[PDB]
Design a protein around this ligand. Structure first.
Ligand SMILES: CC(=O)N[C@@H]1[C@@H](O)[C@H](O[C@@H]2O[C@H](CO)[C@@H](O[C@@H]3O[C@H](CO)[C@@H](O[C@@H]4O[C@H](CO)[C@@H](O)[C@H](O)[C@H]4[N+](C)(C)C)[C@H](O)[C@H]3NC(C)=O)[C@H](O)[C@H]2NC(C)=O)[C@@H](CO)O[C@H]1O
Ligand SMILES: CC(=O)N[C@@H]1[C@@H](O)[C@H](O)[C@@H](CO)O[C@H]1O
Ligand SMILES: CC(=O)N[C@@H]1[C@@H](O)[C@H](O)[C@@H](CO)O[C@H]1O
Length: 572
C-alpha cells in the first residue's frame, strides 16, 4: 500500500497524526519533519560552526546530480573517486524497494579544494570545510563545498549527502533549500581499534567498516594485526611467521589486500594505522625461532592475564633482525600512515623470569631479578625496537604505546620522551595516571575502558559468567564520555579518542553490531565536543542508526522503531 500517517513538529518533537484527506495543510513525511524539528536536523555529527538549514526543502531529480571539481591537482583521482561516490550516497536517503519519481531540480555540486596537491595524513592536517546550498536560477540547485584540503572537502561531501531526505508519502527526493555550514573537527585523531588477531576479519568487512567510519567522519582505523593467538599479517621477509601463525592459509592479509584497504581508506579520509604489539602478546608464528618464552605456558594464570601466554626474548639479537623486517614489510604496505603503534601492553615479569637465557643476561648486566630490572629489560627492548621502526619507516615518526607499568608517569621520562611517544589510555577517565601524564607533557589517545571498550558485556570466554569489563557499554555512556572533561585545561594534549573492539569474542560475523552505531557516538563526541549530553543527541542517533542499516551495515538496534516514529513518548 501507501503510507497512512503524517508528522507535525510540536516543541522539538515530531508527532504522528492521521494524514486526513480534508486538510489544506501539506502533510509532512517523518524525516522531512525531523529535518526542521530537530535543532541540527538529520546531521551526524552536528557541525561545530555555523549550522543553518533554513526552513524549506526542494524536490530533486536523482539523475540530474552533477559534480564539478574547480581546482585540479595531485588529489585529482581521489576527488574524482569521491565525486563518483556522491550519487551512491545521496541514494542512501531512499529506503530499499522505494523508487523516487525522476522530476524536480538539477543539482550542481561545486568542489573547491584550495590545496589540491595535499594527500598526506598528519595530526596537523586541515579537515575544515564550508558548505553552502542555494537555488540557482529556476530549475537547479547550487551546492558549493570549499575546503583547505581534500580531507575537509570529502567531509563536506558527507555532510552534503546528509541534506537529502526521501518523502515516502509523495515518492519525492528532497533536499534542504538554503544551507550555510562551516565545520571543523575538535580532535585530529578519531579512531576505531580493530583486533584481527584474536579472531579473523574478512577484508570486505574491514572495507565496510571503513565506509561506516567515513559516514560519521572517523579518520583512523587502528589495525591491531598480530597477537599471541595468530599472525595473519603477510610478511614477505619472514614468511614462516604467517605460515605457522595464521589460523588457516585463507585467514591472512596479503600485500595486495592490505594495499586495497589502505587505498580504500585514503579515498575516504581514513588513515590505516598498523600495530605490531611487542614485547608481550606474541605467540603463534614464532615457534622454533627460539625468540619467545612462555608460549602456551601452563597454568596460564601464573604467567599472563589471558591465554595463550607468550613474550619476546629481548636478549636475542636475531630478534631485532626479525623486528626490522616485519616493520619494513608493514611500512611498505601501510604507506599512508604518519604514526606507528608499538603496543606495550603489560609485560609479565613472571614470564621473563622463567627463562634461563634472560636471567643469565640480567646477571651479567648486574641487574637483579627484581621489578625495576625487568623494567630495564623492557626499556632495552623498546629502545632497540624503536630504532628498527625508525629505520623501517625511513624516518622518525610518532610512536604509540599503551598505558602500562612502563608508562607510569612517575618514571616514564627515564624511558620515553613526550615528543616521540603518544600514550593510548585504557584506564578509567578518573584515574590519576591521566593527570600525571598530562602534567608531564604527554599526548593522549583516550580509549578508557569504562566508556570505550566495545567488547565488554558478553558471556565469559573462559569459565562462566560475563566477560572481564562487563557491563555492556551503551551509546549513552560513550557519548557523555568527554576527553575535555577528563583532561581539563590540558585538553590540547588530547589528540582524540578510539573505540576499541578486542576480538576474543568478535569476528567477521559480529563486527557491524559491535561498532555500529556506538562508534557514531564517539564520532560526534570527538568531532564536536558538545557541552550537551546524549539525550540532546538521541533523535539524531536513531536516524544515523537507520542510515547505517540502509548502507548495508548490520547495526545494533537501539530502540523500538515506534520510538523513532513517536518522539517524546519513550523516556526515563
Ligand atoms: C581468572 C580469574 O578467576 N580471575 C579472578 C578475577 O576475579 C580477578 O582477575 C581477573 O582476571 C582476568 C584474567 O586474568 C582479567 O581479565 C583480563 O583483563 C585484561 C585487562 O586487565 C584483559 O586484557 C586487555 O583487554 C582486552 C580485552 O578487553 C584484551 O584484548 C587486551 O589484550 C588487553 N589490553 C587492552 C590490556 C591490551 C584480558 O583480556 C582479560 N582476560 C580474560 C578475561 O581472560 C581481569 O582483568 C581480572 N579482573 C580484575 C577485576 O582484576 C582477580 C581479582 O582479585 O581475581 C582472580 O582470581
Ligand atoms: C555558479 C554559482 O552560482 N556560484 C556561486 C558562488 O559565486 C558563490 O560564492 C557560492 C556561495 O554563495 O555559491 C555559488
Ligand atoms: C620478580 C621475581 O619473581 N623474581 C624471582 C626471584 O626473586 C627469585 O629469587 C628467582 C629465583 O629463580 O626467580 C624469580
Amino acid at each position: 500500500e501507501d503510507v497512512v500517517w503524517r508528522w507535525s513538529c510540536d516543541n522539538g518533537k515530531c508527532v504522528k497524526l492521521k494524514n486526513d484527506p480534508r486538510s489544506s495543510e501539506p502533510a509532512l513525511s517523518l524525516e522531512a519533519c525531523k529535518m526542521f524539528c530537530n535543532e541540527y536536523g538529520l546531521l551526524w555529527p552536528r557541525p561545530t560552526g555555523e549550522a543553518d538549514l533554513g526552513n524549506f526543502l526542494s524536490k530533486i531529480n536523482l539523475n540530474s546530480i552533477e559534480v564539478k571539481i574547480l581546482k585540479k591537482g595531485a588529489t585529482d583521482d581521489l576527488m574524482e573517486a569521491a565525486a563518483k561516490r556522491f550519487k551512491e550516497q545521496v541514494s542512501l536517503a531512499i529506503p530499499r524497494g522505494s523508487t523516487p519519481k525522476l522530476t524536480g531540480k538539477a543539482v550542481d555540486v561545486y568542489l573547491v579544494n584550495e590545496n589540491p596537491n595535499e594527500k598526506a595524513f598528519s595530526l596537523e592536517m586541515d579537515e575544515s570545510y564550508g558548505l553552502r546550498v542555494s537555488p540557482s536560477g529556476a530549475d537547479r540547485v547550487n551546492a558549493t563545498i570549499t575546503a583547505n584540503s581534500f580531507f575537509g572537502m570529502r567531509h563536506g561531501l558527507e555532510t552534503l549527502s546528509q541534506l537529502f531526505v526521501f518523502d515516502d508519502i509523495r515518492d519525492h527526493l528532497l533536499m534542504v533549500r538554503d544551507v550555510n555550514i562551516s565545520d571543523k573537527p575538535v580532535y585530529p585523531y578519531r579512531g576505531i581499534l580493530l583486533d584481527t588477531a584474536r579472531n579473523y576479519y574478512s577484508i570486505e568487512s574491514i572495507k565496510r567498516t571503513i565506509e561506516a567510519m567515513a559516514a560519521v567522519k572517523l579518520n583512523t582505523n587502528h589495525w591491531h594485526i598480530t597477537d599471541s593467538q595468530s599472525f595473519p599479517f603477510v610478511t614477505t621477509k619472514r614468511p614462516n611467521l604467517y605460515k605457522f601463525g595464521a589460523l588457516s592459509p585463507q585467514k591472512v592479509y596479503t600485500k595486495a589486500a592490505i594495499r586495497e584497504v589502505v587505498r580504500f581508506g585514503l579515498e575516504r579520509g581514513v588513515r590505516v594505522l598498523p600495530e605490531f604489539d611487542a614485547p608481550a602478546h606474541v605467540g603463534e608464528g614464532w615457534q622454533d625461532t627460539d625468540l619467545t618464552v612462555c608460549f602456551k605456558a601452563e597454568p596460564w594464570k601464573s604467567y599472563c592475564v589471558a591465554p595463550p601466554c607468550g613474550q619476546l626474548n629481548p636478549t636475542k639479537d636475531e630478534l631485532y633482525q626479525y623486528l626490522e623486517d616485519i616493520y619494513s614489510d608493514m611500512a611498505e604496505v601501510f604507506d599512508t600512515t604518519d604514526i606507528f603503534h608499538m603496543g606495550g601492553d603489560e609485560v609479565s615479569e613472571a614470564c621473563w623470569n622463567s627463562s634461563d637465557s634472560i636471567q643469565n643476561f640480567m646477571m651479567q648486566n648486574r641487574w637483579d631479578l627484581d621489578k625495576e630490572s625487568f623494567l630495564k629489560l623492557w626499556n632495552y627492548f623498546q629502545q632497540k625496537a624503536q630504532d628498527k621502526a625508525y629505520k623501517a619507516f625511513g624516518k622518525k615518526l610518532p610512536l604509540i604505546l599503551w598505558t602500562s607499568t612502563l608508562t607510569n608517569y612517575k618514571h616514564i621520562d627515564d624511558y620515553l620522551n613526550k615528543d616521540d611517544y603518544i600514550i593510548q589510555v585504557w584506564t578509567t577517565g578518573v584515574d590519576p595516571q591521566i593527570k600525571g601524564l598530562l602534567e608531564k607533557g604527554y599526548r593522549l589517545i583516550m580509549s578508557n575502558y569504562d566508556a570505550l571498550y566495545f567488547d565488554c558485556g558478553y558471556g565469559a570466554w573462559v569459565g562462566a559468567g560475563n566477560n572481564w569489563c562487563s557491563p555492556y557499554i551503551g551509546w549513552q555512556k560513550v557519548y557523555d564520555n568527554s576527553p575535555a572533561v577528563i583532561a581539563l585545561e590540558h585538553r590540547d594534549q588530547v589528540l582524540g579518542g578510539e573505540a576499541a573492539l578486542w576480538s576474543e569474542q568478535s569476528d567477521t560475523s559480529t563486527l557491524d553490531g559491535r561498532l555500529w552505531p556506538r562508534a557514531a557516538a564517539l564520532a560526534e563526541r570527538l568531532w564536536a565536543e558538545p557541552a550537551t549530553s546524549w539525550q540532546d543527541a538521541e533523535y539524531r542517533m536513531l536516524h544515523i542508526r537507520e542510515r547505517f542499516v540502509r548502507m548495508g551495515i548490520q547495526a545494533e538496534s537501539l530502540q523500538p522503531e515506534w520510538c523513532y516514529q513517536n518522539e517524546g513518548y519513550c523516556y526515563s
